Amino acid sequence: AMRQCAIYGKGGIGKSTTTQNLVAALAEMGKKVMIVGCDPKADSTRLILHSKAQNTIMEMAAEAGTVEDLELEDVLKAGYGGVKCVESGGPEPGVGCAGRGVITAINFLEEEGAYEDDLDFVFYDVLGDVVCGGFAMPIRENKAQEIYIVCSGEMMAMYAANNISKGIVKYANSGSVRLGGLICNSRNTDREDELIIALANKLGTQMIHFVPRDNVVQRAEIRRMTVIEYDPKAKQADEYRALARKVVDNKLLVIPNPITMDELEELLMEFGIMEVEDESIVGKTAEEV
Amino acid sequence: QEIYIVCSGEMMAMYAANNISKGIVKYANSGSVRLGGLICNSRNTDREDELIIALANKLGTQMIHFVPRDNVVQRAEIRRMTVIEYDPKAKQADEYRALARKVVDNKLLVIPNPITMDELEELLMEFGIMEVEDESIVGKTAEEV
Amino acid sequence: AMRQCAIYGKGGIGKSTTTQNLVAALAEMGKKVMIVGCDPKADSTRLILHSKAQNTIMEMAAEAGTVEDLELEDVLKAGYGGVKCVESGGPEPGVGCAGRGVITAINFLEEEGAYEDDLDFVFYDVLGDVVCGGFAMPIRENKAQEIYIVCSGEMMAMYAANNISKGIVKYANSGSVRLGGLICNSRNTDREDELIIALANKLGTQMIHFVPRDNVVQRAEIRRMTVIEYDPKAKQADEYRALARKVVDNKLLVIPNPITMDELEELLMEFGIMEVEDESIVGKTAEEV
Amino acid sequence: AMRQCAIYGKGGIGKSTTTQNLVAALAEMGKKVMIVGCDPKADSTRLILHSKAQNTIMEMAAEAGTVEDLELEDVLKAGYGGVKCVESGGPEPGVGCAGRGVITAINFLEEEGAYEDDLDFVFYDVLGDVVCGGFAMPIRENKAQEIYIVCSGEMMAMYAANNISKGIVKYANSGSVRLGGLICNSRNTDREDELIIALANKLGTQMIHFVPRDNVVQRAEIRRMTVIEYDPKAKQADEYRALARKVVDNKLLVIPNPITMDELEELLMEFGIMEVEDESIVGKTAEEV
Amino acid sequence: ATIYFSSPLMPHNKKVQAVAGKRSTLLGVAQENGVKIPFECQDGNCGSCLVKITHLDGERIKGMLLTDKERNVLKSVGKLPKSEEERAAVRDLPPTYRLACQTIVTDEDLLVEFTGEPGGA
Amino acid sequence: ATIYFSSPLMPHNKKVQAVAGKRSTLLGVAQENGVKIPFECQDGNCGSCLVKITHLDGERIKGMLLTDKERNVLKSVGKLPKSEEERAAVRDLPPTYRLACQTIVTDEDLLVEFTGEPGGA
Amino acid sequence: MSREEVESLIQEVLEVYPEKARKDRNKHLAVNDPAVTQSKKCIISNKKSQPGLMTIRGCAYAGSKGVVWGPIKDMIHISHGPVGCGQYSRAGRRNYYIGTTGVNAFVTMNFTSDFQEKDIVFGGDKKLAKLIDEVETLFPLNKGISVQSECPIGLIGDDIESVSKVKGAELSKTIVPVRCEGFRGVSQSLGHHIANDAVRDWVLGKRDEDTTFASTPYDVAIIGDYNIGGDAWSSRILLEEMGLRCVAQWSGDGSISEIELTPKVKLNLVHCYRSMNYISRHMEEKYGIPWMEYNFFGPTKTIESLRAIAAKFDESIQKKCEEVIAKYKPEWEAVVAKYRPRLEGKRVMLYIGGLRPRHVIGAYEDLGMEVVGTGYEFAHNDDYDRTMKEMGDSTLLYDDVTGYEFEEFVKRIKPDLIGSGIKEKFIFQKMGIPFREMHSWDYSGPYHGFDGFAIFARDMDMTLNNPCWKKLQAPWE
Numbered sequence A, C, D: 001a002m003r004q005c006a007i008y009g010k011g012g013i014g015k016s017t018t019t020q021n022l023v024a025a026l027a028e029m030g031k032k033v034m035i036v037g038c039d040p041k042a043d044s045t046r047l048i049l050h051s052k053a054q055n056t057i058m059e060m061a062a063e064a065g066t067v068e069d070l071e072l073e074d075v076l077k078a079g080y081g082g083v084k085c086v087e088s089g090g091p092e093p094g095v096g097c098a099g100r101g102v103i104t105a106i107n108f109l110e111e112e113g114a115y116e117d118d119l120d121f122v123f124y125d126v127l128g129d130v131v132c133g134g135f136a137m138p139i140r141e142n143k144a145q146e147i148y149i150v151c152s153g154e155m156m157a158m159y160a161a162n163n164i165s166k167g168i169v170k171y172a173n174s175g176s177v178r179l180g181g182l183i184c185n186s187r188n189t190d191r192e193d194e195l196i197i198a199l200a201n202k203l204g205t206q207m208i209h210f211v212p213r214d215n216v217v218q219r220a221e222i223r224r225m226t227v228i229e230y231d232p233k234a235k236q237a238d239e240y241r242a243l244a245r246k247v248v249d250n251k252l253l254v255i256p257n258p259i260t261m262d263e264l265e266e267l268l269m270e271f272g273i274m275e276v277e278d279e280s281i282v283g284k285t286a287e288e289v
Numbered sequence B: 001q002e003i004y005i006v007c008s009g010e011m012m013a014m015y016a017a018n019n020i021s022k023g024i025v026k027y028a029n030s031g032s033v034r035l036g037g038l039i040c041n042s043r044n045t046d047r048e049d050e051l052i053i054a055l056a057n058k059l060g061t062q063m064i065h066f067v068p069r070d071n072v073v074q075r076a077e078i079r080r081m082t083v084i085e086y087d088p089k090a091k092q093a094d095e096y097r098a099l100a101r102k103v104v105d106n107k108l109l110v111i112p113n114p115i116t117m118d119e120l121e122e123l124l125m126e127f128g129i130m131e132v133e134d135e136s137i138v139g140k141t142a143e144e145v
Numbered sequence E, F: 001a002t003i004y005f006s007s008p009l010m011p012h013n014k015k016v017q018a019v020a021g022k023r024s025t026l027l028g029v030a031q032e033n034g035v036k037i038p039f040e041c042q043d044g045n046c047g048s049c050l051v052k053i054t055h056l057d058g059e060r061i062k063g064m065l066l067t068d069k070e071r072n073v074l075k076s077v078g079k080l081p082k083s084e085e086e087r088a089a090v091r092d093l094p095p096t097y098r099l100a101c102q103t104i105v106t107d108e109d110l111l112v113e114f115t116g117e118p119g120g121a
Numbered sequence G: 001m002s003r004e005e006v007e008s009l010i011q012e013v014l015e016v017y018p019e020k021a022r023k024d025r026n027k028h029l030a031v032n033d034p035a036v037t038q039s040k041k042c043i044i045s046n047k048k049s050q051p052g053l054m055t056i057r058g059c060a061y062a063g064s065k066g067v068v069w070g071p072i073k074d075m076i077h078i079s080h081g082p083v084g085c086g087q088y089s090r091a092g093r094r095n096y097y098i099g100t101t102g103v104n105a106f107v108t109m110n111f112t113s114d115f116q117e118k119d120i121v122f123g124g125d126k127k128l129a130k131l132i133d134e135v136e137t138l139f140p141l142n143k144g145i146s147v148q149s150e151c152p153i154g155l156i157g158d159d160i161e162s163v164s165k166v167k168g169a170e171l172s173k174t175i176v177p178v179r180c181e182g183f184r185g186v187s188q189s190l191g192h193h194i195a196n197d198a199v200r201d202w203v204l205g206k207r208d209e210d211t212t213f214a215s216t217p218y219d220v221a222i223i224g225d226y227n228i229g230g231d232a233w234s235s236r237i238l239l240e241e242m243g244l245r246c247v248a249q250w251s252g253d254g255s256i257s258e259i260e261l262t263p264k265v266k267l268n269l270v271h272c273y274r275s276m277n278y279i280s281r282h283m284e285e286k287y288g289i290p291w292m293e294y295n296f297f298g299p300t301k302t303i304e305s306l307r308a309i310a311a312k313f314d315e316s317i318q319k320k321c322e323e324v325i326a327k328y329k330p331e332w333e334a335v336v337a338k339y340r341p342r343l344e345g346k347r348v349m350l351y352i353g354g355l356r357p358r359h360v361i362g363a364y365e366d367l368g369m370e371v372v373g374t375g376y377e378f379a380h381n382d383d384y385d386r387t388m389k390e391m392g393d394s395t396l397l398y399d400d401v402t403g404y405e406f407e408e409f410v411k412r413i414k415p416d417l418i419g420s421g422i423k424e425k426f427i428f429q430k431m432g433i434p435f436r437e438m439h440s441w442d443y444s445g446p447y448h449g450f451d452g453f454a455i456f457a458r459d460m461d462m463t464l465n466n467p468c469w470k471k472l473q474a475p476w477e
């Protein structure tokens, strides 16, 4: 009854903090969870462990004798709430696929038996800038049963969500990979939540929640701690708890309907994110025409 | 043959610049590929202009030009026209022309000695983009401690 | 705080004497230094140990069965000022690669613990007459943190310096190996001092010091003693102390952008080492044309 | 009846010029000859072709499709006297054995059939700094029937000759490789010829000739021509002709007797190259003892 | 046992049938079949016959003894990382780089690659 | 035909007996024997099934047709140098890098190596 | 004794050695520190033996033919080579079995090619084929043939794999060529590895495509138990009173069919890690069968191992395990009550091959006996990692001990009992120090399980408290 979930999101919108807070909320709710940080950067699994730059699976493999002699205790470390978090890491930027670490980490964890123990949730934190190679490996294989997309108000986040939905619909007929819903991180945009709701409607899915931005998150991350561990009584704490409650009770798994670029532009123009461009102003400059 | 990295005051931009620099040195043996110099885009950060020059010298390169943010560029974008074709008399056009001239007579082609993650952390801590934290309450509840 | 340095260069230009004088000048400052010679001939530590043909690691290992039986006391001998000296040696010509001696010596020293005690500097004296993978072990591996090339006005010395610089950039991605700066040995060439500085800037480095030729160094060599231990009040000792001081506070570690063969030809043509020839009688008899 | 000869000599004593002049003298004496320049630098085969930097076999192989698609006409070019000269070249200085080009060139030439044509002399120009890897490949195999060593007055040239003789005696029982004799290039040393004669006597061989130094050689090389082609009437021209006459009439092929380092020092001390070092002066400095 | 000799010098890889466990140590096989691996010594202390051996069967790799002579020569050449030395010492599994004059052929399919160069470089 | 699948992902190289010339194109063989080569398309225009094929027999290499689709995909990925393209076009000899979804097994011994990554990188 | 006395003793012993041998032997001796987990920081192992020092190790032939392949009863084991290797190892190991010897079982029979000088010069590949034909002629009920190579076989260059394949194709019989030459390894451990490789490559995979075997969720296999004195039997019953069905034993009282049926089980219980981990890992990798190490020496270890094995299964198996423990509790309690007062405080020094120097420690602890020193002949550093957590602080450890080293250690420490092989028994029996053969159980046993613990205690009491150890000193001296 293990639930394999993958949080896909482009870098730069605080995906790691949302994932770690959701995992902490699930841990405090009497659930045993595991984190695999598929981000090439080691930003994930830092707030839970309270230790910066947990050693990656790639670094430990290159340390001595590749994967074969690597012990399971060296890669995953217990953190807050009794969770087990392991960092995958990435190769040298110049050489190889940037998602090779994801493939190596998943294959190592499957062979070692880190999943066969009694776990309920396994969360893969994956970048959404490019859905290809090792980044699309969880989707291409049946490693991630549910996919949750962390989106934002800017164009790039919505485009990344559309690309991830395209990858979901590509392998829909092979495995049981489904898009559970969209998670929104607040960029303080006035119409951000409504724009995400509209995008989820166009993708044929639900917006599972909307995470507001507040300085308590910044204080928690500057102290290398989760908001829930920093202040269980804060409003953001119960917000994350409600998000976890909705995630664990979620039953809407659907093959999405990716939208075209023009339809994506329609949402931005409609919700005021992007201004409407008149056809007459194009091609002619000021102070001449 | 020549690489020009566009970076900003944000930490992710540098990080990407450092990754590109590490990629450059990997294949420097095979062919003649060198870093011409970092370019900048003003995100209206107070220390943004002086942050990038602190990186160019540490990478052995030069900040070729600091580009300032102006509303004329954005108002030219909605016309689907470059700012130098839109308002040639604008000071933004004068900058861009200075940038182009510097690009032309740029003979500084060096291998970009890459910085490490902690070295990048230290400069961002120094310039106030992110604040230095030390021995704070870690792993403890805020009200408990 | 150990600064593992190496001194490459073409043989026959008095590289060994300059290196030994430099190490003796370091030792005069109280720095704990160690010389690890890498030439097939054990001539690299004959002016500090006051000895003749110091026993090599290869010979001792051959006579003592294997390297597993050798003792550090036999290999490592102390000299003037406390600078411990080790000669790697080399194999017989016809058998195998000639660069096994340096690799064996480095492994033996790192296994016995000679590096870890208190050393501030560990100079490797490598023969750079031919740049091959056997002698490039300090560069191919991360043993030689800093490189100092000994060059002269002669074209072969530069050529060797350029080859070493090309070798450095090949392995710069793997480890932190940088060119500290070119050193010079005065062959009494008029343009020799200004020729090397024309190379250091073109290689992105600095000529750390121009060493002038003096008869006192040669008269100290026949005593099997360094010139700074022979005549401390000599100006040669002052210049060698300046060289040592510059070596100490040298923070310029850059990747040596290599020059091409024609670029090296042009500078030698300019400085009068060789004269420029153009459209002369070529392929024709002198009396015929 | 093909005569395979190899001229072994350390770089920096003008081996290439002597080899090219000897080959030209043999060509003018009604003999069809071939040159393989095994020097990693392309200095060889430059005076005969009158063209700088003939393309190497390694460069042409790396140009397109390695050795297999390489045409025999691309690598060897006809030069003065109707000779066929081909440059072997070398790899990148940092990677691989510096003598790999020798192995690749010899294997390519054997398979193509550049030897099966009617030739009388095939001269391999090989460096003597290190006798190992591809440099010792002609000696290790039976590719070079006769070996001629270019020696000089300094210690390094004699040591290189001793090392080459050690390689000759190593494979004496396997193939027919023999040391024909020693060739001396004048370093303007007063007792150079007598020192070379003494060294040949100690090695159990003959000094085939002594080549004096004169400015006609410099004028020929600055015009990218052989002395014989530049001025057949010059004294150096007939000197090279006599050297060729002695080489083609040479019948003394002997396994040499390598000498120890101390015996080599004895020759230098005896002939005034190196001063005699008294034991009392060692260990004590001036103005103190 | 089937041994596939591969090298840049060789125009094509050569397939050779060999008898396992003979006193000839895969050099003898190479010399019988004309494969030219550089062997330049008679005691075993040089690195010239260095080769890279890949076990093509994977599930048929045999246990072997890594003699201290071969181990020391490989460490002197620099083709024996700490992990592979530990694996050979503890689990009796062969390393990736071997010396072709001290390697006894086992009953499996092997791919032997050499560069026609001495072991060191 | 004997095919040896090798990869960093695979704990050991796998030896597989295969029938030459089947419509299954060495992907079918990999999928039958559990070897996991990344195949992410059904027409043949991606580079994911890129593999490196080494002919272990050398003197038993068979002639084959390099279809313009496979050639264009290999050139788009960048694993088809001019020399190998010319060799395939003129002498009908296979290149070193192939696409595991378009490579028909021939009656020889082959070593197929993949990195578990798409063709481009 | 403290760590300071033991190190002084170690240096005094090593003082007599030549400097190279002294340096080599200094690495193999250490004083136990239970806080150390990485034994490589203290003890080196699996190294060659120093020539001329009278070691106690064996050969790869002993490890393969003598230890692993030998106990298989339904097969015929040819000793290819001269007569001596096969003759000396015949019936010297007490691996019990059930069968009609010479008809369907062949454990205590010596089959050899008996090489003469005409076979060293002209080879022996035709003699092997003729021998296989004669074996098939005279022993028709054999279920397989295993040709164990002796030293000359590898040196003269004999191809036995080809002969095995040809004759197996001809006779439709399983013929396994084992290249267990004596010179191939430094000790018997490489013999274990070679024998496991032969089993994996020639026998194990025969029934990969057969599904006619009726598997159950309670199927287990006993791996690395060679039935010395009946040991495996005493274990097997203890595993069938808990409801588990032992499908195969490897290899004591084992048959070629149980080996082939082994891949059809749900768990591999490995007793000797050293000799059978090579095949346990292969089975886990290929068939997915998990494996675990169990110890049946003494009541405590037996109870712990039974509880772990039950925990590997469902609740009914755990209830049956508790029932078995409750049933056998009074039996071993009576043995302890009778024998512990007699064996309280006694000090023991052990030196056995690769498993028992750490397995039997629990049995001596249950009788109040302290192991003041243990060591192996051919153990690796996976064995010393497991050992360091078993021995007490400041206890001596040795690896590949020589005769001189062992004798001097025994003379200084003066243990009350010594456990080692036949080659040391009389050396210490002439020194007035009681000795127990821990290899063959001194022709007694079994020692595994709860039934073997009584025999263990009785033997230890009868040897340590024998009245023959008080009479060595003549009354007139």
Ligand code: ICS
Pocket (backbone or CB within 6 Å): G063, G067, G188, G226, G228, G272, G273, G274, G275, G352, G353, G354, G355, G356, G357, G438, G439, G440
């Ligand atoms: S197989 Fe081994 S020497 Fe594990 S070779 Fe040896 S019948 Fe010993 S300590 Mo004789 S690794 Fe068995 C053994 Fe132990 S023959 Fe017996 S007693 S438990």
Ligand code: CLF
Pocket (backbone or CB within 6 Å): G059, G060, G061, G062, G082, G083, G084, G085, G086, G088, G149, G150, G151, G152, G180, G181, G182, G183
């Ligand atoms: S290591 Fe045999 S006892 Fe020996 S002299 Fe030959 S007949 Fe006699 Fe092992 S395989 Fe055997 S037991 Fe030795 S010989 Fe080798």
Ligand code: SF4
Pocket (backbone or CB within 6 Å): C096, C097, C098, C099, C131, C132, C133, C134, C135, D096, D097, D098, D099, D130, D131, D132, D133, D134, D135, E118, E120, E121
């Ligand atoms: S790499 Fe250098 S030292 Fe080694 S064999 Fe080649 S030329 Fe000789």
Ligand code: FES
Pocket (backbone or CB within 6 Å): E038, E039, E040, E041, E042, E044, E045, E046, E047, E048, E049, E050, E073, E099, E100, E101, E102
């Ligand atoms: S040839 Fe010298 S090591 Fe094998």
Ligand code: FES
Pocket (backbone or CB within 6 Å): F038, F039, F040, F041, F042, F043, F044, F045, F046, F047, F048, F049, F050, F073, F099, F100, F101, F102
């Ligand atoms: S899988 Fe698309 S090319 Fe083979």
